[model samples]
Target chain A: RRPEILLVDSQEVILQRLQQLLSPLPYTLHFARDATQALQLLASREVDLVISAAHLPQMDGPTLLARIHQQYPSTTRILLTGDPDLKLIAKAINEGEIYRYLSKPWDDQELLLALRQALEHQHSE
Target chain B: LNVATVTRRPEILLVDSQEVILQRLQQLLSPLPYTLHFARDATQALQLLASREVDLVISAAHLPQMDGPTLLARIHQQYPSTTRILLTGDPDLKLIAKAINEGEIYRYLSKPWDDQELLLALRQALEHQHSERERL
Candidate 1:
C-alpha cells in the first residue's frame, strides 16, 4: 500500500504548486489550510507524515507538531520557514523535534531527495 | 484566462515571536502563490488552526504560553492532518533522535539554515505526508 502523506499550509497556490511538483511521486496527497481543519482530517484518517510552514495563523508549526507528537507519536514531521534565527532553530529542535529544516524558495530536486530520504528513514525505523 | 487554468494555492502558517521573522517569511513565500498566516504565540496559533484548514505549519520553538514541542503535541492530538515543522538553533541530536524514533519528526535542521534548503525540505516533507496517506 502506498504511504499516506499530509501537507498543511495557508496558500492554495502553494498547495497546487506542490501537487504539481510531486505529481510523479508514489503516494497520496492531502491538503489543509489551517491547524484546526488539519486536526479534523487527522482524526478521520491515518497519516504517515506531515509537512508544515512555520507561520501558521492559529497553532503554528511547533504547536501543531507538539499536539501530534503527544497524540500520534508516529507521524513524521518537517518544518519550513524563511527566518533562520538561532533561538527559533534551537526551540524547534528541542521542542518540536523536527527531522529536517528547509528555507524558502526550495529546489525541486533537493526537495525530492529529502522526502525520499525521510521516507526511507521512516521505513528503516 | 480559462477557468480550468486557474488553480488554488496552498496555505502556509508561520509562527514566531519576532514580527520581523513573520514578515520576512511572508514576503519570501508570497511569490509562490500561497496564502500566508502569522501568529505571535501558541494561543493565537491554536485559534487559527481551529478556525481554518491549514496545509502546513512552520513555527519557532519558543512561545509565550506553550513551547513549540508542546504545541506540536497538542496539534497531533487535536489536528493530525496539518503537517508540523520546528525551527531551532540548538539542534539537539538526542531530542531529534527521540522525536524521530517515536515518529514525531520528519526533519530537524539548525539555525541559519539555507533558504533553498528550507524550501527543499518543505517540499519533501509534503511529499512524505502525501505518500503516507496513500497507504491508508
Candidate 2:
C-alpha cells in the first residue's frame, strides 16, 4: 500500500465525520471498530499511521496503541480520544508513545497537522 | 547545552489537596536522588514555584478553586521549560483538553497510581527535559 491509514473508533457517527474530513486526502483509509478489529486489519497489511480513540469497548485506545507500538515499531501512532482522560492519554503518550494526541472535537487544521507530522516522521524513519 | 547543571537530580513539585499523596509519593520516590517539593493546593504550589526552579511538576486534577490543569497552565506561562504531569481520579475531558492545549502537559496518570509506573513516567519526563534543554 502506498500510504495506509488505520482509524479505530467504535461509533458510526464519529467515524462518519472523520471519514468525511479525511476523504479529501489521497490515502488508503482502513476502518475498524476497536483494537481487535484494528489488529486484524494490521495482520494482513502494513500501515504507515494509526489514529485511535481512548474510549472503546474491547481493547481501549491506549492499550491498542501499546500493542501497535510493540508489533509495528516503525509505524507512526496518533491518539484522538473522546474523553481525553489524562491517565489513559498520558499513558499512551509516555508509555505507548504516539506521534501526537488530539482531543475530541479536534480542530481540522490541528488534526491535519498531526497527520502530516506523523506521516513525515514515518517517512523519514 | 548546559548539560552539567540540568543533568543533576531533577526537581519535582507534587501538588494535591490532601496530605496522603504527599507522604505516599515521598516513600515511592525516596530512592531517587531528586528534590521533591509538596503543596496542599495550587496556591501553595504557585508560591513554591515562585521560590524555586522545578524541572517537573505532578499535580492532582481536582482542587478547591484552582484545578490541576489551571495550575499547570500557570506554570507553563511562567516557566515554559518545566515539564508537567497530571494525576486525577476525576474523569474530566474538558480539563484534560485544557491541560494539553493550554498546559502542554508532558504526561498524566490516574490516582491510586502505581509506584513503578509513576516513577517510570517522572523519570522519563526528567530525561526528556534534559534532552529538550540540551537540544537548544
Candidate 3:
C-alpha cells in the first residue's frame, strides 16, 4: 500500500480544501475533525505522516502530534498555522518535533513540495 | 515594475567539532550571500553568538561540553529570534524532539547530507528567519 497521511483540523472547509489539494498525490489521505478522532484513527491505522492544523477543538494540534510522536514514532509530523504563536510553535517543535510547518494562505505548489520533500526525507532516514 | 533593495545579510553559525565538516560547510556556504562563523564546540558557538547577532545556528549533536540540542535550547532562551538546526549522524528522536519543543529548532538534518539539501535548508531557514523578524 502507498503511504497514508492523516490530516487533523477542526475546520470543515480547510479539511475539504486540503483533501482536494492533496487527493492527486500518491498517498491515501485520512481526515480528522478533531484530536479525538485523530488519535482514534491513529490507534486503528498505520499512518505514514500527519499534517495537523495548529488550532483544534479539544487539544491543540502540537500536543496531538506530540502524542503521536510518543505512540507512533515512525510517523512524520507536520503543522499548519495561520497565526505563528511563538509558544505554540515552540510546543510543536520541541514536543511534536514536526517535520515542517506551513503558514496560512499556504501556496499549493509550496505545500505539495514540502510534503514530497518530507516524505522523501523520512524514507531516507 | 519596482526594484527591491537589499536588507541586512543573515549571519549563520556552524557548530561542529569535526574539521572536515566545518571545512566542508565553509566551502559550500562561502559562495552564498550570508556571513558564516565557525565554532569548535558549544562554548565557542555560544561565545560567538553572544558577541554578535546570529540569525541561524547549525550544530552537530555531540559536542565536547554539551549536546547540540541543549546548546540550541540555551540559545533559544537567550535569543528567541535565532533559528536552530541540528545535524547528526546518530539518531535520537526523543532527544531531538525535546530540543525541537524547547528550542524551536527549524530543521534537523543528518550528517552526510546531500549538498543541495543542506544549502536549501539553510536558504529556507534564513528566509523564515527574515519573515519572522518582519512579523514583529
CA lDDT, every model vs. true structure: 0.70, 0.82, 0.83
- Off-target runs (Cα >4 Å) in candidate 3 are A1-125, B1-4
Positional deviation of residue A86's Cα in model 2 after best superposition, in angstroms: 8.2
- The count of residue-pair clashes in candidate 2 stands at 0
Which tens-of-lDDT digit does each residue in B24-122 have in candidate 1? 676668788778899889999899999997767777767799777677667765777677776666455434433333325455544556788788767
lDDT of 3 by residue, B56-113 (tens): 9999988999888889889988986788998877655545644564555887777888
For candidate 1, give the lDDT of residue A32. Answer: 85
Give per-residue CA lDDT, model 2, range A48-77, as digits (tens). 899998888888898999888888988888
Residue B31, candidate 1: alpha-carbon lDDT: 80
lDDT of 1 at A73: 76
**Per-residue lDDT over B54-94 for candidate 2, one digit per residue giving the tens place of the 0 to 100 score:** 88999998887698888888998797668888887776767
For candidate 3, what is the total of clashing residue pairs? 4
Best by lDDT: 3
Q: Candidate 2 chain A, which ten residues in sequence have the lowest lDDT sum?
A: A82-91
The per-model DockQ list reads: 0.08, 0.26, 0.09
lDDT of 1 by residue, A1-125 (tens): 68777888877877787889887788888888888978988998888778777777888777787777678777777766666554554455545656666665667776676688778756765
TM-score of chain B of each: 0.80, 0.89, 0.92
Interface RMSD of every predicted model, in angstroms: 6.5, 3.1, 9.7
